[PDB]
């Protein structure tokens, strides 16, 4: 039920991508293989301690959202947490990026722009190799709304995150950026394949 809800979010938020599948592959849906709840007490507490601090700075409201994250480093993330020291060249600078559309995070699973794809077949559209996405609790707090590229090193003054909003000459889909790794928790590890349309 918790997992059916995660599967529903994963499938229903897929969009057709402007790059025609170059980065993440060609698909309309996934084959969801496994959904695992990550239980890392030390990381959870690091997350909730910061969430409380952010809520206190944002009119008693954490502005928490469940968002996707794609990375070749899912294993390190679930053990050590998100780490801004790994994050300036990105559209919103040196942040940790999240999507509300699973297929946008799927474009980052094998690297920026999909890298060279899966390690076995070197295919960004591999229907064989199993992929992993994270479905994360993300504390946005007071989120700075931005439409165009703004290369920042940290959250804007008085803010806790950046929300990249869609615009005609800019973003096709939203994205959410934090500048402190403790503002996200890798709640669910989703193992899946993209499916041939
Ligand atoms: N990861 C996501 O799910 C993700 C979702 C949404 C937008 C992103 N934009 C940039 C990057 C990004 C990935 C790696 C590096 Cl090194 C820098 C930025 N990731 C993104
Ligand atoms: Zn493959």
Curated annotation (Swiss-Prot):
Binding residues for Zn(2+): 118, 121, 126, 129
Part of the full-length chain shown: 963 to 1160 of 1166
Oligomeric and partner information: Oligomerizes and associates with TNKS. Interacts with the cytoplasmic domain of LNPEP/Otase in SLC2A4/GLUT4-vesicles. Binds to the N-terminus of Grb14 and TRF1 with its ankyrin repeat region. Interacts with HIF1AN. Interacts with RNF146; this interaction leads to ubiquitination and proteasomal degradation. Interacts with NUMA1.
Role of this protein: Poly-ADP-ribosyltransferase involved in various processes such as Wnt signaling pathway, telomere length and vesicle trafficking. Acts as an activator of the Wnt signaling pathway by mediating poly-ADP-ribosylation of AXIN1 and AXIN2, 2 key components of the beta-catenin destruction complex: poly-ADP-ribosylated target proteins are recognized by RNF146, which mediates their ubiquitination and subsequent degradation. Also mediates poly-ADP-ribosylation of BLZF1 and CASC3, followed by recruitment of RNF146 and subsequent ubiquitination.
Domain (PARP catalytic): residue spans on this chain: 1-197
UniProt signal peptide: none
Name of protein: Poly [ADP-ribose] polymerase tankyrase-2
Localization terms from the record: Cytoplasm; Golgi apparatus membrane; Nucleus; Chromosome, Telomere
Organism: Homo sapiens (Human)
Free-text description of this protein's post-translational modifications in UniProt: Ubiquitinated at 'Lys-48' and 'Lys-63' by RNF146 when auto-poly-ADP-ribosylated; this leads to degradation. Deubiquitinated by USP25; leading to stabilization. ADP-ribosylated (-auto). Poly-ADP-ribosylated protein is recognized by RNF146, followed by ubiquitination.
Highest taxon listed in the record's lineage: Eukaryota
Family label: Belongs to the ARTD/PARP family.
Tissue: Highly expressed in placenta, skeletal muscle, liver, brain, kidney, heart, thymus, spinal cord, lung, peripheral blood leukocytes, pancreas, lymph nodes, spleen, prostate, testis, ovary, small intestine, colon, mammary gland, breast and breast carcinoma, and in common-type meningioma. Highly expressed in fetal liver, heart and brain.
Lineage of the species this protein comes from: Eukaryota, Metazoa, Chordata, Craniata, Vertebrata
């Amino acid at each position: 039920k918790e997992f059916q809800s995660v599967e529903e979010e994963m499938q229903s938020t897929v969009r057709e991508h402007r790059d025609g599948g170059h980065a993440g592959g060609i698909f309309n849906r996934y084959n969801i293989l496994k959904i695992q709840k990550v239980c890392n007490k030390k990381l959870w507490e690091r997350y909730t301690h910061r969430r409380k601090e952010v809520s206190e700075e944002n009119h008693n409201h954490a502005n928490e959202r469940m968002l996707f994250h794609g990375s070749p480093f899912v294993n390190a993330i679930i053990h050590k947490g998100f780490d801004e020291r790994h994050a300036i060249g990105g559209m919103f600078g040196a942040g940790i990026y999240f999507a509300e559309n699973s297929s946008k995070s799927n474009q980052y699973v094998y690297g920026i722009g999909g890298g060279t794809g899966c390690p076995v077949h070197k295919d960004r559209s591999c229907y064989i190799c199993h992929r992993q996405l994270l479905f994360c609790r993300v504390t946005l707090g007071k989120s700075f709304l931005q439409f165009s590229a703004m290369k920042m090193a940290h959250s804007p003054p008085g803010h806790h995150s950046v929300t990249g909003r869609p615009s005609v000459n800019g973003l096709a889909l939203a994205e959410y950026v934090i500048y402190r790794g403790e503002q996200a928790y890798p709640e669910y590890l989703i193992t899946y394949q993209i499916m041939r349309p």
